Design an enzyme around this catalytic site. Structure first.
Site, PDB file in Angstrom:
ATOM      1  N   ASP B  25     -50.939  51.951 -58.081  1.00 54.54           N
ATOM      2  CA  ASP B  25     -51.286  51.958 -56.582  1.00 54.54           C
ATOM      3  C   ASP B  25     -50.781  53.138 -56.035  1.00 54.54           C
ATOM      4  OD1 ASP B  25     -51.936  51.618 -53.995  1.00 54.54           O
ATOM      5  OD2 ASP B  25     -50.550  49.609 -53.808  1.00 54.54           O
ATOM      6  N   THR B  26     -51.471  54.510 -55.990  1.00 54.68           N
ATOM      7  CA  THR B  26     -51.023  55.589 -55.383  1.00 54.68           C
ATOM      8  C   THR B  26     -50.614  55.461 -53.812  1.00 54.68           C
ATOM      9  OG1 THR B  26     -53.139  56.474 -54.706  1.00 54.68           O
ATOM     10  CG2 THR B  26     -52.278  56.866 -57.141  1.00 54.68           C
ATOM     11  N   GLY B  27     -51.214  54.444 -53.154  1.00 49.95           N
ATOM     12  CA  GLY B  27     -50.749  54.175 -51.849  1.00 49.95           C
ATOM     13  C   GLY B  27     -49.527  53.284 -51.609  1.00 49.95           C
TER      14      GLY B  27
HETATM   15  C1  LIG Z   1     -56.582  46.074 -50.613  1.00 53.53           C
HETATM   16  C2  LIG Z   1     -57.445  46.599 -49.761  1.00 53.53           C
HETATM   17  C3  LIG Z   1     -58.777  45.958 -49.518  1.00 53.53           C
HETATM   18  C4  LIG Z   1     -59.427  46.813 -48.402  1.00 53.53           C
HETATM   19  C5  LIG Z   1     -58.972  47.794 -47.849  1.00 53.53           C
HETATM   20  C6  LIG Z   1     -57.776  48.220 -47.980  1.00 53.53           C
HETATM   21  C7  LIG Z   1     -57.429  49.386 -47.312  1.00 53.53           C
HETATM   22  C8  LIG Z   1     -57.060  47.801 -49.017  1.00 53.53           C
HETATM   23  O1  LIG Z   1     -55.586  48.091 -48.925  1.00 53.53           O
HETATM   24  C9  LIG Z   1     -54.846  47.607 -48.303  1.00 53.53           C
HETATM   25  C10 LIG Z   1     -53.549  47.718 -48.819  1.00 53.53           C
HETATM   26  O2  LIG Z   1     -52.452  47.612 -47.871  1.00 53.53           O
HETATM   27  N1  LIG Z   1     -53.023  48.287 -49.865  1.00 53.53           N
HETATM   28  C11 LIG Z   1     -51.681  48.363 -50.549  1.00 53.53           C
HETATM   29  C12 LIG Z   1     -51.764  47.677 -51.709  1.00 53.53           C
HETATM   30  C13 LIG Z   1     -52.023  46.106 -51.433  1.00 53.53           C
HETATM   31  C14 LIG Z   1     -53.202  45.781 -52.178  1.00 53.53           C
HETATM   32  C15 LIG Z   1     -53.557  44.367 -52.054  1.00 53.53           C
HETATM   33  C16 LIG Z   1     -52.790  43.444 -51.425  1.00 53.53           C
HETATM   34  C17 LIG Z   1     -51.655  44.035 -50.709  1.00 53.53           C
HETATM   35  C18 LIG Z   1     -51.187  45.258 -50.830  1.00 53.53           C
HETATM   36  C19 LIG Z   1     -51.491  49.754 -50.571  1.00 53.53           C
HETATM   37  O3  LIG Z   1     -52.133  50.352 -51.604  1.00 53.53           O
HETATM   38  C20 LIG Z   1     -51.218  50.720 -49.302  1.00 53.53           C
HETATM   39  C21 LIG Z   1     -50.096  50.492 -48.276  1.00 53.53           C
HETATM   40  C22 LIG Z   1     -50.180  51.682 -47.283  1.00 53.53           C
HETATM   41  C23 LIG Z   1     -49.193  51.537 -46.289  1.00 53.53           C
HETATM   42  C24 LIG Z   1     -49.612  50.894 -45.164  1.00 53.53           C
HETATM   43  C25 LIG Z   1     -48.574  50.558 -44.156  1.00 53.53           C
HETATM   44  C26 LIG Z   1     -47.392  51.261 -44.125  1.00 53.53           C
HETATM   45  C27 LIG Z   1     -47.192  51.984 -45.174  1.00 53.53           C
HETATM   46  C28 LIG Z   1     -48.068  52.200 -46.136  1.00 53.53           C
HETATM   47  N2  LIG Z   1     -49.059  50.597 -49.009  1.00 53.53           N
HETATM   48  C29 LIG Z   1     -47.875  49.465 -48.712  1.00 53.53           C
HETATM   49  O4  LIG Z   1     -48.364  48.382 -48.200  1.00 53.53           O
HETATM   50  C30 LIG Z   1     -46.667  49.646 -49.631  1.00 53.53           C
HETATM   51  C31 LIG Z   1     -46.215  48.481 -50.205  1.00 53.53           C
HETATM   52  C32 LIG Z   1     -47.516  48.071 -51.408  1.00 53.53           C
HETATM   53  C33 LIG Z   1     -45.091  48.606 -51.180  1.00 53.53           C
HETATM   54  N3  LIG Z   1     -45.765  50.132 -48.636  1.00 53.53           N
HETATM   55  C34 LIG Z   1     -45.141  49.306 -47.747  1.00 53.53           C
HETATM   56  C35 LIG Z   1     -43.861  49.655 -47.404  1.00 53.53           C
HETATM   57  C36 LIG Z   1     -43.579  51.134 -47.100  1.00 53.53           C
HETATM   58  N4  LIG Z   1     -44.295  52.075 -47.921  1.00 53.53           N
HETATM   59  C37 LIG Z   1     -45.374  51.719 -48.749  1.00 53.53           C
HETATM   60  O5  LIG Z   1     -45.875  52.262 -49.519  1.00 53.53           O
END
Ligand SMILES: Cc1cccc(C)c1OCC(=O)N[C@@H](Cc1ccccc1)[C@@H](O)C[C@H](Cc1ccccc1)NC(=O)[C@H](C(C)C)N1CCCNC1=O
Ligand SMILES: [Cl-]
Ligand SMILES: [Cl-]
Ligand SMILES: [Cl-]
Ligand code: NA
Lengths: 99, 99
Positions: B25-27
């Protein structure tokens, strides 16, 4: 380009004529952007994040440029803390994860 | 390998003597695994994103094997809906995004 991951993979996108910052996210199935106006009709969708699900607006066939790469596809709009480019548009611009 | 993004980039990991499937997960800034025991000290942490915040346990200096590649780093453990390999360990296996 080749983008390493020592910092967040943020790029500039252009959507509705406007430049925004967004995260290239291989962990996101779909693309979700903060509140903005987009043309046409939208459909309901839920997506799940680290803390639970949110409701978003699904817009199809939206013109969007990602790091200079032109794409046309589905953009979700809603209360996301960060703009996210997910796999639906990463695939369209040819992005792969390599190691 | 080169992983395309038509599907979720799931791989097998070995952590704590256990095999799990996890999302590259690059995000994600951080690595978050579903509830399990790990050795050593830990401290509480809150992480929040889409859907809100969850409380996790932060364990430092934990070895993980990710798709056959060893790394070491901080692992968060808690009620994540999906096991996630975030940038702190993706950098260590040399993963890049390419397009
Ligand atoms: C899964 C999915 C389906 C449809 C559409 C979307 C956008 C989808 O992705 C939703 C999603 O939250 N994906 C996460 C991983 C995901 C996939 C499936 C279920 C749950 C999670 C992750 O990759 C991105 C998201 C980005 C983010 C959002 C708000 C604040 C900061 C960062 N990243 C995070 O939450 C991370 C966590 C994982 C350590 N995170 C949070 C603490 C601060 N920094 C940080 O990097
Ligand atoms: Cl699409
Ligand atoms: Cl780390
Ligand atoms: Cl590097
Ligand atoms: Na430790």
């Amino acid at each position: 380009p080749q983008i390493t991951l020592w910092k967040r993979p943020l790029v500039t996108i252009k959507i509705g004529g406007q430049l925004k910052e967004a995260l290239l996210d291989t962990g996101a199935d779909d693309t979700v952007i903060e509140e903005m106006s987009l043309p046409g009709r939208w459909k309901p969708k839920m997506i799940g994040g680290i803390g639970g699900f949110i409701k978003v607006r699904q817009y199809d066939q939206i013109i969007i440029e990602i790091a200079g790469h032109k794409a046309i596809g589905t953009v979700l709009v809603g209360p996301t803390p960060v703009n996210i480019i997910g796999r639906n548009l990463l695939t369209q611009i040819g992005a792969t994860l390599n190691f």
